[PDB]
Coordinates of C-alpha atoms and ligand atoms in Angstrom, one line a residue:
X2 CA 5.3 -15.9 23.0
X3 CA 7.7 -17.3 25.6
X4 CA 9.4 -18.8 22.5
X5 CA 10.5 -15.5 21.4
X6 CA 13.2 -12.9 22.9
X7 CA 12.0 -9.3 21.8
X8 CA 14.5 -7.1 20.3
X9 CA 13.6 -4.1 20.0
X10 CA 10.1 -2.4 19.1
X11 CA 10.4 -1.2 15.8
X12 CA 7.1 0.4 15.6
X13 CA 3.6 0.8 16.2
X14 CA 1.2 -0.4 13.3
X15 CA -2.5 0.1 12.8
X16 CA -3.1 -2.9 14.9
X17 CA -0.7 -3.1 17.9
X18 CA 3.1 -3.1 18.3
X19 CA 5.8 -4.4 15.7
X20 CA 8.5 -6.1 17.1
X21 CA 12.1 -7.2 16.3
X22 CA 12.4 -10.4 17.5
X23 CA 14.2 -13.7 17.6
X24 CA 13.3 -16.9 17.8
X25 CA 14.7 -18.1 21.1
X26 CA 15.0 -22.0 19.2
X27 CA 15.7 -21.5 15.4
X28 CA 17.3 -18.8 16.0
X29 CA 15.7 -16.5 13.4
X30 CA 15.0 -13.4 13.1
X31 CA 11.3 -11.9 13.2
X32 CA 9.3 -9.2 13.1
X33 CA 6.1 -9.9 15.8
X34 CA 3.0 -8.6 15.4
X35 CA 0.8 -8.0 18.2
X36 CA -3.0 -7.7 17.5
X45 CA -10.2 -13.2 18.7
X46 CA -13.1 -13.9 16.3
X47 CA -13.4 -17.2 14.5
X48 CA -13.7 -15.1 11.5
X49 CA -10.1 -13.1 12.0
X50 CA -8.3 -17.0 12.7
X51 CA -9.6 -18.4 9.6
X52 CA -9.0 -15.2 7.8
X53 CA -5.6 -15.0 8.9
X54 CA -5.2 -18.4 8.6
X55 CA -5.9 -18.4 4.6
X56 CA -3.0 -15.6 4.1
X57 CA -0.5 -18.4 5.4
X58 CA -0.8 -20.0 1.7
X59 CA -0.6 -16.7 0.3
X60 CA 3.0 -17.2 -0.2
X61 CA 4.8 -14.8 -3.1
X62 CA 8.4 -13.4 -3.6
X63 CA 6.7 -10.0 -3.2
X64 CA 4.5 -10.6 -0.2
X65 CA 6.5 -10.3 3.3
X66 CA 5.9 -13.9 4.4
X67 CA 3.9 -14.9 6.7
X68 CA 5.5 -17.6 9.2
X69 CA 3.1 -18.4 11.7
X70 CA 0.1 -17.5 14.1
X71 CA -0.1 -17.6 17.6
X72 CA -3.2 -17.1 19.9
X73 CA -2.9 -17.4 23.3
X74 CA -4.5 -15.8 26.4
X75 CA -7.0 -14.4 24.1
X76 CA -4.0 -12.9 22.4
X77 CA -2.7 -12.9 18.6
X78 CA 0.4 -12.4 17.1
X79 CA 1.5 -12.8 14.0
X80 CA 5.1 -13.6 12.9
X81 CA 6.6 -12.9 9.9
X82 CA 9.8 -12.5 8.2
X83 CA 12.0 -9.6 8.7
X84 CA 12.5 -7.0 6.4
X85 CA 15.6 -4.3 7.7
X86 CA 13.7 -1.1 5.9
X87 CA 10.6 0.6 4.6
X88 CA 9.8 2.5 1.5
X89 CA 9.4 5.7 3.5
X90 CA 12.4 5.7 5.2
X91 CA 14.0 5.1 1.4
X92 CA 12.4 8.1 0.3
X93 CA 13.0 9.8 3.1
X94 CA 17.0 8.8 3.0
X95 CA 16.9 9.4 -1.1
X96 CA 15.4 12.8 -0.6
X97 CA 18.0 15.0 -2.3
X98 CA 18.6 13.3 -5.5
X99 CA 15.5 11.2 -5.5
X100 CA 14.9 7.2 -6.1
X101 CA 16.9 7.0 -9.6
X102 CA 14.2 5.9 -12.4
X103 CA 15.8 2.2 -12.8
X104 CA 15.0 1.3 -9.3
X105 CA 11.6 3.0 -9.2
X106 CA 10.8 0.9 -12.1
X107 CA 11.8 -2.4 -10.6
X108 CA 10.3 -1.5 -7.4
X109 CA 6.7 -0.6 -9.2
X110 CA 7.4 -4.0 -11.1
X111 CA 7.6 -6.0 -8.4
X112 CA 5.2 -4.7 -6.5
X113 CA 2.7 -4.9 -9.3
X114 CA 4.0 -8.4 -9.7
X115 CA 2.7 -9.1 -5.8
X116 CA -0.6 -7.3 -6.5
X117 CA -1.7 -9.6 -9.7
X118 CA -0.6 -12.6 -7.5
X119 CA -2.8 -11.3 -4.6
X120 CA -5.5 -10.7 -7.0
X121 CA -5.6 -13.3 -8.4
X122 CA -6.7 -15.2 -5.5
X123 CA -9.1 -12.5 -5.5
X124 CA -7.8 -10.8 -2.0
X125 CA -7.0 -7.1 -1.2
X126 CA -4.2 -5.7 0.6
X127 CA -6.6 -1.9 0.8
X128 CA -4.0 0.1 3.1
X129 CA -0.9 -0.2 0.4
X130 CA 1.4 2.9 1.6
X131 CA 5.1 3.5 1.9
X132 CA 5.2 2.5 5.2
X133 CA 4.3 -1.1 4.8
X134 CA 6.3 -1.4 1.3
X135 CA 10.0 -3.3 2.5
X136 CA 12.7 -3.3 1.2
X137 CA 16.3 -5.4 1.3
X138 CA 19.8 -5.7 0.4
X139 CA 19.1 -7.7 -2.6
X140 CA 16.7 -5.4 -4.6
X141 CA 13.9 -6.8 -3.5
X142 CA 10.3 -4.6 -2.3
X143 CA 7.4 -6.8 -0.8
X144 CA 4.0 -5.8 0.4
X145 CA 3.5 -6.2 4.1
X146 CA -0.1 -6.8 6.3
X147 CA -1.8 -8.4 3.3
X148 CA -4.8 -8.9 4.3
X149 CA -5.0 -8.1 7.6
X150 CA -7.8 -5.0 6.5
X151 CA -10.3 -7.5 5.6
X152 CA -9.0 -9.6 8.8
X153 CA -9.0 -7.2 11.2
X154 CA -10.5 -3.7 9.0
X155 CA -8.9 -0.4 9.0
X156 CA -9.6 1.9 11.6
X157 CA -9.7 5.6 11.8
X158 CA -6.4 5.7 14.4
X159 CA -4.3 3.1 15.3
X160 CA -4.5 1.7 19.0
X161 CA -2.0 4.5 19.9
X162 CA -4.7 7.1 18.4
X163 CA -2.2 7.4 15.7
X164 CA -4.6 8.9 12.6
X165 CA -4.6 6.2 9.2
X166 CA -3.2 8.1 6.7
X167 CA -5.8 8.6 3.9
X168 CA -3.1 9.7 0.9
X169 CA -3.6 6.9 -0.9
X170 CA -7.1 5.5 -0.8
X171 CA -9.2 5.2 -3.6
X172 CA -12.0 7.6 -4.4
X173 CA -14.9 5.0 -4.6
X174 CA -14.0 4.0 -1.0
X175 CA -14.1 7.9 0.1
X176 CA -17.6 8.2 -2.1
X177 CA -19.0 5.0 0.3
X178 CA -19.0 2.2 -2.4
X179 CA -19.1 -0.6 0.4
X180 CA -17.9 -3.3 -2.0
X181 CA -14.9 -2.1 -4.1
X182 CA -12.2 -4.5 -5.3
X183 CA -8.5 -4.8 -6.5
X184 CA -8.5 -1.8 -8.1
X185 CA -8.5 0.2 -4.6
X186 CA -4.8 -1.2 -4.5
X187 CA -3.6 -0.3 -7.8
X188 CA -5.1 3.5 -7.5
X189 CA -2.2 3.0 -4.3
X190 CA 0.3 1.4 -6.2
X191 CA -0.5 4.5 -8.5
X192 CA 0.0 7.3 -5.8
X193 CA 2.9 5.8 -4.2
X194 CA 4.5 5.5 -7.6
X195 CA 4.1 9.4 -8.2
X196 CA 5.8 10.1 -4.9
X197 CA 8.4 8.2 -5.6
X198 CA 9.0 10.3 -8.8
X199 CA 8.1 13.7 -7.3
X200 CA 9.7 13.0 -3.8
X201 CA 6.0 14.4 -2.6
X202 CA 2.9 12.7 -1.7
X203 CA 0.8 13.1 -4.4
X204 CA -2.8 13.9 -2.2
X205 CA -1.8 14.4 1.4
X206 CA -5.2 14.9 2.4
X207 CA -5.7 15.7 6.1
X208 CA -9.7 14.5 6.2
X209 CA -11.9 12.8 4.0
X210 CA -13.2 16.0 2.3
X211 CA -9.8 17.4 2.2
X212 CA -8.4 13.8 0.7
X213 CA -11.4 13.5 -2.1
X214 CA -11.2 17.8 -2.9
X215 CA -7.4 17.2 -3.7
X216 CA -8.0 14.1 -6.0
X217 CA -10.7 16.4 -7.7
X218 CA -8.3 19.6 -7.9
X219 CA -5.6 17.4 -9.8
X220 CA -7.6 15.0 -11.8
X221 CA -10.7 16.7 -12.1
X222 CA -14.3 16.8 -10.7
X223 CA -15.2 13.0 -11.3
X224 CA -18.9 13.4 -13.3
X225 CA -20.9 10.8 -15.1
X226 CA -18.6 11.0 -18.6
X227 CA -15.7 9.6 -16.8
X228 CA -17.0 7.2 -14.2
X229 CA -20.7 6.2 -15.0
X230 CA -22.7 5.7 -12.0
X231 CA -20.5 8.1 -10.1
X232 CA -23.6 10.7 -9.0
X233 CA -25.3 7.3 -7.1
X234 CA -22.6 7.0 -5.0
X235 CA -23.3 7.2 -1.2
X236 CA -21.6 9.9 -0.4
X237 CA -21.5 11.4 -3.6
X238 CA -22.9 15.1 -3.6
X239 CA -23.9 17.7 -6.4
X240 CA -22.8 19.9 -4.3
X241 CA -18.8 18.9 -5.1
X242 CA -17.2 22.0 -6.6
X243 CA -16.3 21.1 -10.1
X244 CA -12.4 21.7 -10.8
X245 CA -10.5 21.1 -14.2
X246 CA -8.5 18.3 -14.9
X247 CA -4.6 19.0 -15.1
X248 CA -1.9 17.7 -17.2
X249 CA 0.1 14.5 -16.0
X250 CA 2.7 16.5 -17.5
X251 CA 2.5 19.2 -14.7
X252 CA 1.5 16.3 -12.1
X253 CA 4.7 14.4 -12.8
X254 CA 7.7 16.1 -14.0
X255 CA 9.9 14.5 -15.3
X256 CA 8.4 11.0 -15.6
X257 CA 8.1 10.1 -19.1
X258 CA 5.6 9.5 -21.6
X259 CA 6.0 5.4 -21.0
X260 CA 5.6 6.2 -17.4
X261 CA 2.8 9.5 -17.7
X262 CA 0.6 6.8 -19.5
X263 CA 1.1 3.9 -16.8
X264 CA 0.1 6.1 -14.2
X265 CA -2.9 8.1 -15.7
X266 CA -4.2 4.0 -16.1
X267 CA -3.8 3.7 -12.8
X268 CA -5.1 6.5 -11.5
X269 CA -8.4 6.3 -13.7
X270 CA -11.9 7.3 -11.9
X271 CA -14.0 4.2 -12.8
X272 CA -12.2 1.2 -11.2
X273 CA -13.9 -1.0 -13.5
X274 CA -11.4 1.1 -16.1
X275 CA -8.7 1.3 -13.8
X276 CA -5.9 -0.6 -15.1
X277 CA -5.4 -4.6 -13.7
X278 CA -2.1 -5.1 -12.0
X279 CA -1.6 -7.8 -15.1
X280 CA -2.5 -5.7 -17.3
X281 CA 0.3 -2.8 -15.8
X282 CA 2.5 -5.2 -16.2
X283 CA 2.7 -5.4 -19.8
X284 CA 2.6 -1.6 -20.4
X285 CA 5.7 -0.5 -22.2
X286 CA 6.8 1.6 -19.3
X287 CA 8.5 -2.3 -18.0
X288 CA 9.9 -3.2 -21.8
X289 CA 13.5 -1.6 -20.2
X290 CA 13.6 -3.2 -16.9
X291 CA 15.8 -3.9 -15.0
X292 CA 16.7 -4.9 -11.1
X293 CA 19.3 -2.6 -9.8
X294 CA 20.5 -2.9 -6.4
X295 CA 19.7 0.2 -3.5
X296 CA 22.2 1.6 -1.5
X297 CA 20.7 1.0 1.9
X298 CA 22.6 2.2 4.7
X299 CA 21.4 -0.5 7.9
Ligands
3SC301 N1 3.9 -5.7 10.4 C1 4.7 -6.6 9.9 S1 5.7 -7.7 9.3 C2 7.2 -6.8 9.1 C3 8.5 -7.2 8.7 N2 9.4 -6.2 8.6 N3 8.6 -5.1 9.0 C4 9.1 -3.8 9.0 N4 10.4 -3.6 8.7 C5 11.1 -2.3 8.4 C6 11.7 -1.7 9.6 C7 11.2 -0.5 10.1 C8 11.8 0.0 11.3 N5 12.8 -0.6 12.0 C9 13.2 -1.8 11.5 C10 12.7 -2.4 10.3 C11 8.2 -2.8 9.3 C12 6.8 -3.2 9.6 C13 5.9 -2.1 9.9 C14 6.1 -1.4 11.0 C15 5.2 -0.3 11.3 C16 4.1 -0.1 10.5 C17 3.9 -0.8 9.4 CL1 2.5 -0.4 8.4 C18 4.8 -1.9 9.1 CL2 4.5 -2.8 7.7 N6 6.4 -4.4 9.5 C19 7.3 -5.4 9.2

């Protein structure tokens, strides 16, 4: 760490304390990451060849004291800030496009190495100058898991998990992430979070409420689930056309792929990335204000 002259904190993760920093040598410019089991090293250690235009990169690891910390490269904003800041007139359709692109473009890359980011939210989407959105903490869930609060007690938002990880399933897959992808994409259409639960009854009830009760016609094997109960109310399905005003149809029938029940239906992030919805796209450039 002694190699390294903090900045200034830029916030506090699930983990620990992010960290502007610089490189007291190279002179570059970080973000730190302060989090060991042999299992976390060599997990962590595997994400360091998980290199991708649309993955924040991962520079190196350090573990010392019986400390870790994890540098990576430096990103100047986040996806929730951008919404925030883009509030009144909204994230104009071109660049919500080539950010959904990209990051489904990240997630087939990811998956295709057959690991999970499972905590995708506007928070730890980036942004830059150059048009660019990357994923950040890749991996660290399966690394490190996900707790119920951060180390400051901060609660983990649950807006955008999946429904079979709410039901119990203890061995989803990629498809948690695109059912993310899916919800993030909706905000960034509606300018509001699409299921802001506030618990995991209150988180599952408003997935049910908008897309309807899940039962054994739409996602076979649904009933078994752990913490699946009869007991569920049973609400009606509503239109994407009242969920997502205006998107269009191109865009309607991307996300209703994405947002399916039965992940083993849920659209691939390859797969998304052939859906018409991309046939006009383009990479425009955001006005970020630094
Ligand atoms: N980690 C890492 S690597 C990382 C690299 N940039 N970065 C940023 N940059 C955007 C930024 C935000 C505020 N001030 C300056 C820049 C935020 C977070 C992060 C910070 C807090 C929570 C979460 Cl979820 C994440 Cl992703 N992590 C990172």
């Amino acid at each position: 760490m002694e190699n390294f002259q903090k900045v200034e904190k830029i916030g506090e993760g699930t983990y620990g304390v992010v960290y502007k920093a610089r490189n007291k040598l190279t002179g570059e410019v970080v973000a730190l990451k302060k989090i060991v089991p042999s299992t976390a090293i060599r997990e962590i250690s595997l994400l360091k060849e998980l290199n991708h235009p649309n993955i924040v990169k991962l520079l190196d690891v350090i573990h010392t004291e019986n400390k870790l910390y994890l540098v990576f490269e430096f990103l100047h904003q986040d996806l929730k800030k951008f919404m925030d800041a883009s509030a009144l007139t909204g994230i104009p359709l071109p660049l919500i496009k080539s950010y959904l692109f990209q990051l489904l473009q990240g997630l087939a890359f990811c998956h295709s190495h057959r690991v999970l980011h499972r905590d995708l939210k506007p928070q730890n989407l980036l942004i830059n100058t150059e048009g660019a959105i990357k994923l950040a903490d890749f991996g660290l869930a399966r690394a490190f898991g996900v707790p119920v609060r951060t180390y400051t007690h901060e609660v983990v938002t649950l807006w955008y998990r999946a429904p079979e990880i709410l039901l119990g399933c203890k061995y989803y897959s990629t498809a948690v992430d695109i059912w993310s992808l899916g919800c993030i994409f909706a905000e960034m259409v509606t300018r509001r979070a699409l299921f802001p639960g506030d618990s995991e009854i209150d988180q599952l009830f408003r997935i049910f409420r908008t897309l309807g009760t899940p039962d054994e016609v739409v996602w076979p094997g649904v009933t078994s689930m752990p913490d699946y109960k009869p007991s569920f109310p049973k609400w009606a399905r509503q239109d994407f056309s009242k969920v997502v005003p205006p998107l269009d149809e191109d865009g309607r029938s991307l996300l209703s792929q994405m947002l399916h029940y039965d992940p083993n239906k849920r659209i691939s992030a390859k797969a998304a990335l052939a859906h018409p919805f991309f046939q006009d796209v383009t990479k425009p450039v955001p006005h970020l204000r630094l």
